[PDB]
Symmetry: D4
Subunit: 168 residues, 8 copies
């Protein structure tokens, strides 16, 4: 289905549009919805637990303050044998960033691998550059070293992966 | 009901969506609607008095310029035995900020208590960081001291309450 | 009608919503529509001439580059015995700014008077602070002196009129 | 039709609204859709190939990182005897910028000519000032010299073409 | 010159006068506040030195010394001594600390305190960041401000600088 | 060197020449404008001193002194004296005030006033913020500008600096 | 003064003491780290010189020298020599490098390392950018921070400066 | 020291060596490029002086002098003379102009030109803004860059500074 992708057995990433499709989420065994937007209200179906993370998709939004709490929630739900959908509006930046943070913390994968993991399943992902700065700091906190660097290009400072992609 | 919360006997906070539900507001004895958005037009039901506060939810929006005027209006309406709904779009930042300012001015509660008060009723509230700077200044004007400080984290400068929340 | 206000015999200001109401505009003798938004497409009724001014409502949007061209168009239409609607999204910032510039250029009124003129008819107007900087420069170009100053408040730098309003 | 313009035999520029009109695009022989927005989901008709370029219309969005890849795709499609629609939301900034970059790279035209080319067909185009900085750099990379300069006006720094337009 | 008396127990000066023990002893100075990072205390035994190691820059957080320096000048005054607050030019860093002192211990508003120091030492010109910090300190002490930052074509400045430019 | 004549009653210089009374008296100088925070007035009795305590920085609001300094140079000229406007390097602060004077009292546009001072003292190079302020002052005086700020790969500069880089 | 001992093999100082070979030889100094762009190494044969050509500015990337300078002080110590780290004022640049050294080689947290150097040389006052860089280096070494940057009315500063302002 | 030879006709130095005519004449120097605002040309008759009145600051538009200074060094070389490019510290301003010269007239990329000057004068350290400008100039000359600006915990720097911090 358009607008949703499976990342792990207990974690899905999506656009806000899929978040109100009760049947689609039940079909995936989704029990918990993390709404990583300020601007989309929770639909509030009784079937799901809802967690609101009220951030804008902006480089200075302090999304990192939710890295541990959302990652811990995804883990808690999984250990209780449920599954989580982390959604934003576009399924591009806010939700992807939180999924990448979760993969690093609970799947022992570096930031480059965590990006490639999510990107393999949802190729449209594109965390904003501030979110990248925050992910890089979090990676350094977890592993004591970084696998993505911010680099200056003629078009702005971006993670090196974006520069590499621009050259095919 | 989703999208509205009672803060005091004469003050409610909400999303813009509830603002056009005449029956819902009448059921709460609401007589005055403060529309704290630029982008949502007043529905203009004859039953309510309307006050437009045309701000964007942005850290440099000078929301503080409305602290006294909106707080005074809420107080005026209450003393005339009515009730006010302060709404924005998401019910997260603009409206919450104005309600917090009102609680400090007319309920003699410090900024930390005023935040906790609104947060107990509407847990999704999350004033943006600029709004926090402005609330902290207003608190200092009212009480000559502050109960929330802006602190630098790896994810940006935020009020200390957000940093504390990030550690559970 | 909600969302439209008459400023002069040949100039109206509005929200984008009124711009597609053919009957409402015909009732006012409107012959020309200035769409001061990037994000709203022209409805394109055959009855009106359309002018697109594709700006965002942001303090660094260079709205001043349209001061002379839009003001000249309003004047041209008026001298051809028609009338212009200048609309944006909210009828608060972009359209009001262009109307204020027109009043200064073709009605020989200073910036404070031009603001008060539009504000008397549409009290919700609130040009953003960058638009204010640009209006102040344009006023200085026209009259060699200014009647509004940008002042620093605890809540940001704003035109003095906003600070004055905050104290009732 | 409103919201779409032909730039070359194999390249069209549009608003997102036209992008879901299967019949309109088939009528133009469009085989590939480049969706240059984060916020509009691909409609996904089977008849078209879709390419998502998930950028916001903001001066610091690093749109330049897509100059070669989108321009190469337009060229690839054309050489395979198809045609591409590059769309954004408003058909003003993101899509126009990518079309201008393509014209420089594959039609051997300088930046001023490439702008005038697109502007002749879709007069509402108005790339944001950051996009202009990026186009100017790309022009310099391609030709070793520039035909548009950023200039400071009372209303902000803008490409010289915008200043020239403001004086009629 | 390079030295001006501000109160009976407070002098403001340039760095040049700070090491001149005869000049300082003739005014009953017992305490030297060196509001510079770049000038070393001479450390004559007869004076106590307090170093305030700040640059003359708008973001130097000089307001963090308003209470500590004001309190020291006051303490020294009460002990029947006198303080010299000096910087390099006697224009900005030292002037700002003296202004803060006058507000805290002489119960005058910011406008009056600035006018007082300016009358005593006409070259004084706190930098615009120091003015922002003085304005906030005034609001803390009195609950209102008597100088506002205003935008001119040449930058945001305290309104007193705008007024001075037209006279 | 370190001193250049700009008009019959106006000289521009480096700080080094400011204290040389023989040099100044030989040119009939009666007024010294010290456009520095960091150099103290020497205060010879025979000259009147005006201090303009600004740093050579783009955000220093030097434009607040355009009228006051221009008016003083004019007043001194009308009294048959002459003024020296000096800074430290004789490059930026003093050059900017002289340019402003020429526009106000010699009825020349900014381009002409810059070319005039540059011809007299080829090292002059107002900082880019001072240029922004000069441009605004020109627009105030004449209602149009003759120098524009332009973006180059090396920063935003007055177009005269861009032109100079290609010749 | 202008020189303070930090450990048995590490001294911190002002530029003034750097060229005084008798003073340095009396402390067994064999290595001079000149943490300034603006002071030239004197180059007496008997000392090895390392230049760290940074300004005392918040965006100077002094953290790029934390490991290299810390490692050199350690190497010199292990060879039974001693190092002088000097800047101009002995306040910010040199203090910051010494603090970084103490964290890396003396296994103390940032708060303790700052308190240590401050106890030895009370005038020390790293600039706020250097503090940001020290905080990040602390987090790299220990996985937690013991000093936080906090907003005050006078600017964002390390919490230790806020605490000092109230005592 | 304070002087280093870069090519047969180009020397780089500190301000201190600029006035030493014997030192300069011994190297066949006929042209002095003074890349400072703050040091006055000594103006010995035997040398031609070119002043480049820039501060050592990241936003100083030094790139506007890349072609003019490179061309002058080349012209002087072709006339069988030699040029000294000096600043104050011989670290940043003069180093940057020399690097630009090597790219334009010695057909080496930015990495090679930096390595060349650094080998000759190990203290060199262009400021980060000068690096941005050098990178753009390299791209203009060659159509590709060999040094990239990269974010470290201590700021955005040329990758060569990041590499140096780990060795």
């Amino acid at each position: 289905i358009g607008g949703i992708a499976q990342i792990t057995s207990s974690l899905f990433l999506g656009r806000g549009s899929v978040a109100s499709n009760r049947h689609l989420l039940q079909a995936r065994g989704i029990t918990c919805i993390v709404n990583a937007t300020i601007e989309i209200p929770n639909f509030n179906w009784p079937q799901f637990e809802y967690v609101k993370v009220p951030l804008a998709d902006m480089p200075h939004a302090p999304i990192g303050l939710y890295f541990d709490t959302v990652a811990d929630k995804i883990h808690s739900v999984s250990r209780k044998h449920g599954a989580t959908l982390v959604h934003c509006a576009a399924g591009v930046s806010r939700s992807a960033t939180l999924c990448i943070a979760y993969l690093m913390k609970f799947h022992n994968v570096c930031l480059l691998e965590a990006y490639n993991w999510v990107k393999a399943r949802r190729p449209v992902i594109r965390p904003n550059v501030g979110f990248w700065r925050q992910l890089i700091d979090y990676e350094r906190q977890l592993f004591g070293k970084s696998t993505v660097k911010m680099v200056q290009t003629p078009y702005g400072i971006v993670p090196d992966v974006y520069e590499k992609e621009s050259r095919h």
